[PDB]
């Protein structure tokens, strides 16, 4: 699957919705074909790989044991309740799979709020005991770079990988282990509606003339002021982001946001 010239990436899927995998397919300049043919060697990825079953398992083993080394990208939270039973691949628990593979990686990137912080299946009452990668695997010394969001901006994944390949090290990380080059500002301080916020000009409802005129969404629940992400700067799909579509930020790059930021339409 790999040896030579392109760096090997092993992409794992735990308890996930595949929205983070889909976000990578939206990669733009570079696009995902350049990424898979030129930049990287994508040596395991259940969504798009040709092999299945035993053949897929063999591809994974050969990638993880390569003397050339591999980078792991991990999507989804790790279910830990009932000894990891709620999530299995090839009849192995995801906790076991990640326990055995991730300490062998040269570097681990937790991609998406589920992998970074536990995510949607970790929201109360967390029936499957879902945990983010670094929480789950603390005891094994795993320290994944956390690229948060639900899903994250794929600009932030490619940027982190490129940095890593260039500099042979993680970029500066915040106290949640997120790169400060992407997560160093609140989405609010970057928001075009900030002048309205400053003037106390809030939309009182989505049907209101104030919402039509683009007034601030804080009274309608916007979590921009407490959320770190680069959404207003980079935007998504080269064209838009939640509050330019008229909807409040729901805080999706923050830990525990399903419980901390709810009800989503209140502040």
């Amino acid at each position: 699957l790999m040896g030579p010239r392109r760096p090997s990436v092993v992409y794992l899927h735990n308890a996930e919705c595949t929205g983070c995998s889909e976000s990578v397919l939206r990669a733009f300049e570079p696009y995902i074909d350049t990424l898979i043919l030129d930049t990287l060697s994508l040596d395991y990825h259940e969504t798009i790989m040709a092999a299945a079953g035993d053949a897929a398992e063999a591809a994974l083993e050969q990638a993880v044991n390569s003397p050339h080394g591999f980078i792991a990208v991990v999507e989804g939270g790790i279910p830990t309740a009932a000894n990891g039973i709620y999530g299995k691949v090839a009849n192995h628990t995801m906790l076991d799979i990640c326990s055995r593979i991730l300490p062998k990686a040269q570097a681990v990137i937790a991609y998406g709020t589920c992998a970074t912080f536990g995510g949607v299946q970790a929201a109360k009452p967390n029936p499957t005991g879902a945990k983010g990668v670094n929480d789950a695997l603390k005891h094994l010394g795993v320290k994944a770079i956390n690229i948060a969001g639900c899903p994250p901006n794929p600009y932030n994944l490619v940027g982190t990988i490129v940095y890593y390949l260039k500099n042979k090290a993680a970029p500066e990380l915040d106290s949640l282990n997120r790169p400060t080059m992407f997560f160093g500002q609140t989405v609010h301080e970057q928001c075009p509606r900030l002048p309205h916020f400053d003037a106390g000009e809030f939309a009182p409802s989505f049907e209101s003339e104030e919402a039509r005129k683009g007034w601030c969404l804080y009274e309608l629940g916007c979590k921009g002021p407490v959320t770190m992400n680069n959404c207003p700067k980079i935007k998504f799909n080269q064209t838009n982001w939640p509050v330019d579509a008229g909807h409040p930020c729901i805080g999706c790059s923050e830990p525990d946001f399903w419980d901390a930021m709810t009800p989503f339409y209140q502040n």
């Binding site: 889909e22 790989m49 299946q121 049907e207 008229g246 339409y265």
Partner: protein, 534 residues
């Protein structure tokens, strides 16, 4: 003689989510099958007690492949519970984002999830690109030249000679495989278009973000309507229209001709993978409270009796747990649903999946593009009839051919083509409505303390329903019954095989170590296990 014994495929790749397929084969043909979904998250448990307005944000994270669809179903569900009738423009914008979702989803499914079951990418290296270009130009109005395809070949050649096959590592076609039929030139055309589709899908998804903020996981729906006042502007509408036009051209000029050239080469696949019963909910309403106002209409068919389409009665759905990892054995209507996990391991107490087993009047029902297409055809839908007839004529087969893995794959293309054209009709109506001076996109509403609601979406994989019981203004019960749950859930308490299980009986398996024929049928249903289990 041939192989007898078990085959297990775990993981089934090139699907969403975590699926284990188990089959018993006898003399090279499958005689028994189990569909085992091996991840549970429990979103229905997590929703209990929360604000109904929050449900769509959680349930959208059921799945990021069929992104938006669950936000739409929960919003339709709470809209219904609250009794709000959203403005015409919110219906148009919601419908336009959903049409864009279908085009993105089906294009990615055929190329990036299904086609490696049928295309030997490495054989493309041996192709004659001049011959290949002539074939490509004969099947499409788009002209392709030898140099066009040589560029692809040169790129693939450098990739393969590095020894780092990446996503093609251990592919079932490596070295050759008796169930792979395509000649090198057709493998090269498909491989070129796979690569092309990786960039085209960026545009198809961007179309959703023009109105819907971002893809994946849109953020423009609210109870009562949508939030995106910018979607009214001529600039955003023009941006959407340009991406839609380019996406439609790809469907018409690249995907459907490839689908037809591959189906022609694999016409033996009309003989495997059939099913008996079909359910569909209809989609693209004019009236949010009348399913029969939808461009595709709901319906139910038993035992392929399409002369007797039955009305869809939402009260005849029950979700079984006897062969699932939940407590007990009692089937439940989703307004009385229960989600009480209880794991017994594979086949412990005859249970083998985290999916429930939905049954309609006690029967297992296929849903998805083949149900939507066949039921619409049988209701006299003129656009569906015109393109399925053209497809049947091109392939030289009769309508019976549609009850198969090949037919299901073709139906996915038919509905893509039909929806790609209908998005233009919807866009024009939306434009017309704005031009009449209707600029309203959200209506006011009030939360009742007690209510029941349901929202119905026909998603790219079929009939999706979200069901809420509101108690004290909070979520008392919230149940998702999702298309892959119908199609890929396990047996019920009458031990009836689900559509995927039944469809697998009779599958030939040339090489038990590389059981591509099982993947062909399983992938034809476009499984989504995060969807099915939630």
């Amino acid at each position: 003689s041939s192989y007898s014994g078990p085959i297990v495929v775990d993981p089934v790749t090139r699907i969403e989510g975590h699926l284990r397929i188990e089959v018993e084969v006898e003399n090279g043909k499958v005689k028994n099958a189990y569909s085992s979904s091996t991840l549970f998250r429990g979103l229905e448990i997590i929703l209990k007690g929360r604000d109904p307005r929050d449900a769509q944000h959680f349930t959208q994270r059921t799945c990021g492949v069929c992104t938006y669809t669950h936000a739409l179903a929960s919003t339709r569900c709470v809209d219904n519970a609250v009794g709000v009738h959203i403005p015409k423009n919110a219906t148009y914008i919601r419908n336009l984002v959903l049409g864009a979702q279908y085009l993105h989803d089906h294009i990615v499914h055929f190329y990036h999830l299904h086609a490696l079951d049928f295309v030997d990418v490495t054989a493309a290296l041996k192709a004659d690109p001049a011959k290949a270009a002539k074939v490509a130009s004969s099947i499409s109005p788009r002209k392709t030249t030898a140099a066009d395809l040589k560029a692809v070949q040169d790129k693939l050649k450098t990739f393969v000679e590095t020894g780092q096959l990446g996503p093609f590592t251990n592919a079932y076609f490596l070295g050759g495989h008796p169930a792979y039929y395509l000649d090198p030139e057709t493998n090269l055309i498909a491989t070129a278009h796979y690569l092309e589709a990786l960039r085209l899908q960026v545009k198809a998804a961007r179309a959703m973000a023009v109105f819907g903020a971002k893809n994946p996981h849109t953020q423009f729906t609210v109870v009562g309507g949508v939030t995106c006042y910018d979607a009214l502007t001529p600039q955003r509408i023009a941006e959407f229209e340009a991406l839609w036009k380019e996406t439609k051209a790809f469907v018409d000029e690249v995907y459907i001709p490839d689908l037809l050239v591959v189906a022609a080469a694999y016409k033996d696949w009309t003989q495997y993978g059939g099913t008996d019963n079909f359910i569909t909910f209809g989609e693209f309403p004019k009236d949010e409270y009348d399913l029969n106002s939808r461009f595709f209409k709901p319906g139910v068919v038993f035992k392929r009796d399409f002369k007797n389409i039955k009305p869809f009665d939402k009260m005849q759905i029950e979700e079984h747990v006897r062969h699932s990892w939940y407590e007990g054995a009692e089937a439940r209507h989703p307004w009385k649903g229960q989600t009480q996990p209880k794991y017994t391991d594979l086949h412990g107490d005859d249970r083998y999946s985290w999916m429930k087993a939905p049954r309609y009047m006690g029967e297992p029902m296929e849903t998805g593009p083949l149900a939507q297409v066949l039921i619409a055809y049988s209701q006299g839908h003129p656009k569906v009839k015109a393109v399925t007839d053209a497809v049947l004529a091109k392939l030289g087969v009769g309508p019976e051919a549609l009850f198969s893995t090949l037919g299901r794959t073709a139906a996915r293309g038919i509905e893509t083509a039909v929806i790609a054209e209908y998005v233009g009709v919807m866009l024009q109506e939306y434009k017309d409505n704005i031009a009449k001076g209707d600029n309203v996109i959200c209506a006011p509403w009030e939360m009742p303390k007690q209510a029941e609601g349901v929202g119905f979406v026909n998603a790219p994989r079929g009939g999706l329903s979200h069901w809420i019981r509101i108690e004290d203004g909070k979520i008392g019960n919230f149940q998702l019954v999702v298309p892959s749950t119908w199609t890929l859930g396990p047996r019920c308490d009458k031990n009836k095989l689900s559509p995927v299980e039944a469809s697998l009986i009779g599958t030939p398996v040339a090489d038990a170590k590389r059981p591509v024929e099982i993947l062909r049928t399983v992938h034809s249903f476009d499984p989504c296990i995060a969807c099915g289990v939630h």
